[PDB]
Amino acid sequence: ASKRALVILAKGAEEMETVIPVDVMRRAGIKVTVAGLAGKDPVQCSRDVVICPDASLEDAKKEGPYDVVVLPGGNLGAQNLSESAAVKEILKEQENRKGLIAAICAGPTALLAHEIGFGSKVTTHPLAKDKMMNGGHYTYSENRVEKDGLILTSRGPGTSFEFALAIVEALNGKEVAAQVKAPLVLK
């Protein structure tokens, strides 16, 4: 049975941190559902790229659970995720069933907002460190990708391939990640 990923897409998401993980995960044979936080309608991202979700989050939740829940970053994206009760429930349930949660850039600040994975070693965008560390609910890390149990974090658009490949490795193993990596012409 193919592994399955839920990518939650909010208005103002960083489109690179959305698309690179979706594409790389799909190359790995993961069944990815791009779920629109605000329904099925096209989502305007942080640099005005417009992406059409596969489904509403409502409908995607019904087809769960997933092997990973992925939170893209972007300022407004992460704010929208942070304010969503529906996201709070999905993350709580995922942590409960001991499922992977992966967040990049400002994405991890939605973990803070929803009290997810307190005590975890995490990274964020440098500019989101102070926000993430407010209240001392995590240990901060400078690693481009950080994985502490079922909490996988990363730093920015430029770490998106490394982030996506860490998810692949976590779900599908090192050999599949190497396969996916081979034609990407990464440095």
Residues binding a second copy (CB under 8 A): 14-16, 19-20, 22-23, 26-27, 34, 42, 46-52, 125-127, 144, 155-159, 161, 183-187
CA distances from 136 to 1, 45, 161 (A): 39, 30, 29
Judged by CB under 5 A, which stretch of 84-92, 133-141, 142-150, 170-178 contacts Cl ion? Answer: 170-178
Concerning whether 105 is annotated as a catalytic residue, the answer is yes
Catalytic residue among 45, 52, 125, 137: 125
Residue 2 binding result from a second copy, Cl ion, none, given CB thresholds of 5 to 8 Å by partner type: none
Residue 178 binding result from a second copy, Cl ion, none, given CB thresholds of 5 to 8 Å by partner type: Cl ion
Closer Cβ to Cl ion, 167 or 177, answer by number: 177
Q: Which of 186, 127, 121 is nearest to 160 (CA)?
A: 186
The Cα–Cα gap between 58 and 130 comes to 32
The Cα–Cα gap between 21 and 41 comes to 21
Two structure tokens written together for 162: 């490394």
Helix axes 15-27, 160-172, angle to 10 degrees: 30
φ/ψ of 114, rounded to 5, equals -100, 10
Concerning whether 137 is annotated as a catalytic residue, the answer is no
Residue 114 binding result from a second copy, Cl ion, none, given CB thresholds of 5 to 8 Å by partner type: none
Q: What are the residues whose beta carbons fall under 8 Å from the beta carbon of 127, sequence distance 6 or more? A: none
Judged by CB under 5 A, which stretch of 3-11, 87-95, 120-128, 175-183 contacts Cl ion? Answer: 175-183
φ/ψ of 152, rounded to 5, equals -115, 120
Binding track, positions 120-139, relative to Cl ion; x by CB under 5 A: --------------------
Residue 23 binding result from Cl ion, a second copy, none, given CB thresholds of 5 to 8 Å by partner type: a second copy
Closer Cβ to Cl ion, 50 or 178, answer by number: 178
Q: Which of 135, 63, 122, 65 is nearest to 95 (CA)?
A: 65
Residues designated catalytic: 105, 125
Binding site for Cl ion (CB under 5 A): 178
